[PDB]
Enzyme design. Sequence first.
Site: not given
Ligand SMILES: Cc1ncc(COP(=O)(O)O)c(CN[C@@H](CO)C(=O)O)c1O
Lengths: 397, 397
Positions: A184, A212, A243
Site C-alpha cells: 500500500s 489491495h 477495500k
Molecule cells: C494491506 C492491508 N491489510 C489489512 C488491512 C486491514 O484492513 P481493515 O482496515 O479492513 O481492518 C489493511 C488496511 N488498510 C487501511 C485501512 O483499511 C489503512 O489505512 O491501513 C491493509 O492495507
Amino acid sequence: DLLSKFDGLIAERQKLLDSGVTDPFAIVMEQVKSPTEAVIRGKDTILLGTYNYMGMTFDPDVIAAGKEALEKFGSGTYGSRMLNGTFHDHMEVEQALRDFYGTTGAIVFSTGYMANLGIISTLAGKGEYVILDADSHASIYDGCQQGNAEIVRFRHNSVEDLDKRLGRLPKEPAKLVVLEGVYSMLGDIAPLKEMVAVAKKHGAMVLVDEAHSMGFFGPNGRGVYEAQGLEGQIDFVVGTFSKSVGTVGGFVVSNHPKFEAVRLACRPYIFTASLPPSVVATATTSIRKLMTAHEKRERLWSNARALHGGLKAMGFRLGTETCDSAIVAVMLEDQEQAAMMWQALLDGGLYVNMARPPATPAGTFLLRCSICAEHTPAQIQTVLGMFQAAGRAVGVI
Amino acid sequence: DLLSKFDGLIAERQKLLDSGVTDPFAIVMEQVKSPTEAVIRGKDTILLGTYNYMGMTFDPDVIAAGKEALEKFGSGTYGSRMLNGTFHDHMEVEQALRDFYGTTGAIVFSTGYMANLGIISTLAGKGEYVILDADSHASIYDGCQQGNAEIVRFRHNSVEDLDKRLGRLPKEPAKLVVLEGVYSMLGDIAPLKEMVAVAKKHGAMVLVDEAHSMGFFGPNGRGVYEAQGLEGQIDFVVGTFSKSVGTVGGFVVSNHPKFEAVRLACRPYIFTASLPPSVVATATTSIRKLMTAHEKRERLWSNARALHGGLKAMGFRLGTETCDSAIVAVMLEDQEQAAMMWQALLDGGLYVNMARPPATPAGTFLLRCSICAEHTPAQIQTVLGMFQAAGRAVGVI
Ligand SMILES: Cc1ncc(COP(=O)(O)O)c(CN[C@@H](CO)C(=O)O)c1O
Ligand SMILES: Cc1ncc(COP(=O)(O)O)c(CN[C@@H](CO)C(=O)O)c1O
C-alpha cells in the site's frame, strides 16, 4: 500520567496545524454524492484517497441487499459467532468467499485488522517462526506482537534476503512466510512467484495479504498470487471487506483440511461480536458481483494507467516506474512540499492521502492516490489538470 | 505443520459431537422473527443467549436510521478514520457517546475487542503497569499482550488483593487499573466503589468496561460505576455497540483533556477501516434512544428478576445469590450435565449459552442466560417451564 507519553505527538500535530494546513486526520465527508465525489469543507471534492477500488459502496444490488438485511434481521447480530452470534448471512458471506477464491475454507472476521492480528498470532506459536516483509501492514506486525512466535523481518521485496533469512532458521519448526500482493505505501507489487518458490524450498507455509488486489488481479480477481500463476500454492490468503468489497470485515481463506479448526483457537474470532446482518449481506452481494465485474475492472486499470502515466509525464516522481496497481504514490522532497501540495489539491477540490514520517520512512513524503473503477475519464483528466496546477504553483514540477 | 497444534481441539470437538449434541459453535439463526425469537434447526426458538439487552436491533428508529445511511452514504466508508475514512455519521456517533456518558472525549473503534486491545496497549507502555481482575474479558488480556507494560493480575472481585498488589508496585510509574462493571461469566457485579477508592489511593488511573451494563445501570444508563456513585472518578470507560446498542463497534470515553491524542498513537484505531455508514447511524440512533429508554429498562430488570428468582426457586445453583445483572448463570456439576441440559432446552425450543472449560475454569460448567427487555412475561414463564422440564428430565433439580 498515562497520557503524558503523548505530549510529543500533541506538539507535532499542533506544529503541523501552525503551518496553516487543514487537520489531515479530521477530514469529514459531510455528504457523499458517489464513490468518487463528496462535499468536504463545503466544496464538491473528487475522492482519490479511498480504497473503494471497485465502487461497490453505491452498487444498487449491494445497497438493496443491505436494506433487506436490516429489515429481515435487524441492526445487529447477537454477539460472538461461537454463541448466539451466527445468522444466515454469515454462512452466505463465507460461502461467497469460498466461491470467489475457489477454496474449501473461509473464516470471516469482524475486521481485516483482526483477521491479520488473529490468523498470524494463532497459526504460529512458541518456537515457530513468522517471516515477514519489512514494510508489511501494521496489522501484520501487530499480529506478530500478539503471538509468541519468533519474528524474522526481511528486506522489502528482496527475494535474496527472504532466502538467506529463511535458510538460517532451524528446519524442523513450522514457519509462516507473510507477504502482500500489493504493498500500500508505494503501490508496488511483490515478486510472489519467486518468494513463494523460496518459501516452499524451506518448507514454509505462505500467507498472502491480497487486500489491495481483490477483484482486479488474476483471471478471477483473486489477487496478485493468482495473476502470477500461484493458484493452489498459497496456504492462506487474507483479505478485507474494506477495500474492493465496500464494507467492514476481514477474512482468511485456505484449502488446508484443518483450516476450520482455527475458529476453535483464534481469540479475535472467538471474543468479538459477529458482523451486522447488513454488513454481511452487502459483502456477500458485492463479493459475488466482483467475480464477474469486468467492465469495472477494465475501467479501474484504464483509470490507473491514465493517472500514473499522466503524473509521470508531468515530472512527478512516482513510487513505481510502471502502473502496477490502483495506487499511485507521488514522492515529494520534504514534509512542507507534501503539505502545501496536499492543501492546494484539497482547496482546488481534490482529496488524496498524505503520508509522512513516521507513517513513511524518515526519507520519504508521499501523496497517495487510489483509483476507483467509477472514476470517469473526465474526472481523471480533471485530477491531472489539478496536480499540474498544484505542482507548478508549489514548484514541485 | 502450523495447523498440527490444533489436533487436540479437533479431537475434543469431535468427542463432544460423539455425545450426540448439536455442534454448539455452529448454531445458525436461519430466520430472526424478533430480538427474542428465531428459527433454529427448523424450530421456533426463544433466544436467551444474546446480549441484545435492550432489544434495539429491531427498534423502528434504529432500522430506519440504518436504511437511510445505506441510501445516503453507501455500504461502506473509505478506509481509515485518519485518511478518507470519516463520514458525517462517525462524528455523530462520537457525540452521541459524549452526550450519553457526559464526557468531553469519545473515540469509536471498529470493534469492542479492538477498543480494549487498543486502549490498553496504547495507554500503558514500557515500565508502566496494567492491573486487571483475574477474570477480565479476553479482549482485556489480549490488550495487555499487545502492549509492553507489566501485567499484574489480582484475585477476582477481591478489593483486598487489588490493594496489596497495587501497594507492592513502585509509586512513580503511571498505572492503569482495569475493571468490569458486570462480569459476563457469572453475571456478577464488581465492588467498583471500593476498588476505585483503592485505585485512587495508589494514584492509579481506572478503566472500567461497562459492556454488560449500558442502558440499564445508573440514573443515566451509564453503567455500574454510575450506579455506585463514581461519576467523575472513572478516568476511562470502555464499551461496545454489540450488547445494548445493537450493532458492531467499540468505544472509549473520558474527560481527560489529552484523551483525543490517543487517536494519534492507537494502532487498532489508525490501521483499520472505519465503520460503515449504516452501522454508525444505527449506533447513533440507538445510543440516543438508550438515554431515555425507561420502559425497556424496567422490563429488562423485571425479566431478569423473574428468571433469576424462578430458577433459584426450582433448585438450580446460580452464579449469583441475588439478581445483579441481566445475566443469569446456571451452574452444573459436570460437562455432560451441561450438554444434555443445553440440548434438552434447544430441542424444547430455547437457546442459551453453554460455557465449559477452558471457557470457564476447570471446576465450572455453566448455562448462561442473557435477558432482553423485549422478552415478555409470558416468554419468561415459558423459559421457566422449559428449565423445569429439562432440569427434571436430566436430573439436575
Ligand atoms: C494491506 C492491508 N491489510 C489489512 C488491512 C486491514 O484492513 P481493515 O482496515 O479492513 O481492518 C489493511 C488496511 N488498510 C487501511 C485501512 O483499511 C489503512 O489505512 O491501513 C491493509 O492495507
Ligand atoms: C466485557 C466485554 N468487553 C468487551 C467485549 C468485546 O466486544 P465486541 O464483541 O463488541 O468486540 C466483550 C464481548 N463479549 C462477547 C462478544 O460480543 C463475547 O462472547 O465475548 C465483552 O464481553
